[PDB]
Amino acid sequence: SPECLIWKLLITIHDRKEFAKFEEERARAKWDTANNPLYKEATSTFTNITYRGT
């Protein structure tokens, strides 16, 4: 039951306050466009062209 093992990690991470602190930090650093979803969308597009049907 690999799912059970993963769940355990979530508990440990959730317990770590540092994890929550990082979450808010990411949102704060969302001022740039590179960290904006649009940036990721553009990357995925290139992946397709740089590697289509092949």
PDB file of C-alpha atoms in Angstrom:
ATOM      1  CA  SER A   1       0.000   0.000   0.000  1.00  0.00           C
ATOM      2  CA  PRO A   2       2.354   2.753  -1.273  1.00  0.00           C
ATOM      3  CA  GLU A   3      -0.435   5.271  -0.698  1.00  0.00           C
ATOM      4  CA  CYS A   4      -0.239   4.620   3.038  1.00  0.00           C
ATOM      5  CA  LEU A   5       3.481   5.353   3.088  1.00  0.00           C
ATOM      6  CA  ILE A   6       2.993   8.641   1.262  1.00  0.00           C
ATOM      7  CA  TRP A   7       0.251   9.669   3.674  1.00  0.00           C
ATOM      8  CA  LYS A   8       2.745   9.300   6.521  1.00  0.00           C
ATOM      9  CA  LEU A   9       5.045  11.827   4.856  1.00  0.00           C
ATOM     10  CA  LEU A  10       2.203  14.320   4.679  1.00  0.00           C
ATOM     11  CA  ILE A  11       1.709  14.083   8.430  1.00  0.00           C
ATOM     12  CA  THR A  12       5.385  14.786   9.089  1.00  0.00           C
ATOM     13  CA  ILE A  13       5.454  17.669   6.613  1.00  0.00           C
ATOM     14  CA  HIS A  14       2.208  19.096   7.983  1.00  0.00           C
ATOM     15  CA  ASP A  15       3.702  18.973  11.472  1.00  0.00           C
ATOM     16  CA  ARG A  16       6.724  20.976  10.336  1.00  0.00           C
ATOM     17  CA  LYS A  17       5.872  24.663  10.680  1.00  0.00           C
ATOM     18  CA  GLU A  18       8.658  25.471   8.232  1.00  0.00           C
ATOM     19  CA  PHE A  19       6.572  23.825   5.516  1.00  0.00           C
ATOM     20  CA  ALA A  20       3.714  26.276   6.071  1.00  0.00           C
ATOM     21  CA  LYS A  21       6.163  29.182   6.215  1.00  0.00           C
ATOM     22  CA  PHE A  22       7.515  28.196   2.807  1.00  0.00           C
ATOM     23  CA  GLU A  23       4.000  28.046   1.359  1.00  0.00           C
ATOM     24  CA  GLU A  24       3.260  31.671   2.222  1.00  0.00           C
ATOM     25  CA  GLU A  25       6.690  32.686   0.957  1.00  0.00           C
ATOM     26  CA  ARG A  26       5.943  31.191  -2.455  1.00  0.00           C
ATOM     27  CA  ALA A  27       2.771  33.258  -2.740  1.00  0.00           C
ATOM     28  CA  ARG A  28       4.661  36.396  -1.728  1.00  0.00           C
ATOM     29  CA  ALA A  29       7.335  35.757  -4.351  1.00  0.00           C
ATOM     30  CA  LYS A  30       4.502  35.494  -6.872  1.00  0.00           C
ATOM     31  CA  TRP A  31       5.208  39.066  -7.900  1.00  0.00           C
ATOM     32  CA  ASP A  32       7.368  37.954 -10.800  1.00  0.00           C
ATOM     33  CA  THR A  33       5.994  36.435 -13.994  1.00  0.00           C
ATOM     34  CA  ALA A  34       8.525  33.607 -13.914  1.00  0.00           C
ATOM     35  CA  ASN A  35       6.738  32.213 -10.864  1.00  0.00           C
ATOM     36  CA  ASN A  36       3.351  32.807 -12.465  1.00  0.00           C
ATOM     37  CA  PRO A  37       1.387  29.858 -13.970  1.00  0.00           C
ATOM     38  CA  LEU A  38       1.848  31.496 -17.345  1.00  0.00           C
ATOM     39  CA  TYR A  39       5.560  30.721 -17.072  1.00  0.00           C
ATOM     40  CA  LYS A  40       4.910  27.016 -16.564  1.00  0.00           C
ATOM     41  CA  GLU A  41       2.373  26.966 -19.391  1.00  0.00           C
ATOM     42  CA  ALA A  42       4.998  28.366 -21.747  1.00  0.00           C
ATOM     43  CA  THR A  43       7.501  25.724 -20.652  1.00  0.00           C
ATOM     44  CA  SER A  44       5.047  22.907 -21.343  1.00  0.00           C
ATOM     45  CA  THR A  45       4.507  24.326 -24.825  1.00  0.00           C
ATOM     46  CA  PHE A  46       8.212  24.197 -25.663  1.00  0.00           C
ATOM     47  CA  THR A  47       8.396  20.615 -24.421  1.00  0.00           C
ATOM     48  CA  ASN A  48       5.828  19.671 -27.048  1.00  0.00           C
ATOM     49  CA  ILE A  49       7.663  21.381 -29.911  1.00  0.00           C
ATOM     50  CA  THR A  50      11.110  20.331 -28.740  1.00  0.00           C
ATOM     51  CA  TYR A  51       9.607  16.857 -28.554  1.00  0.00           C
ATOM     52  CA  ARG A  52       6.528  16.230 -30.677  1.00  0.00           C
ATOM     53  CA  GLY A  53       5.688  12.858 -32.215  1.00  0.00           C
ATOM     54  CA  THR A  54       9.358  12.045 -32.771  1.00  0.00           C
TER      55      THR A  54
END
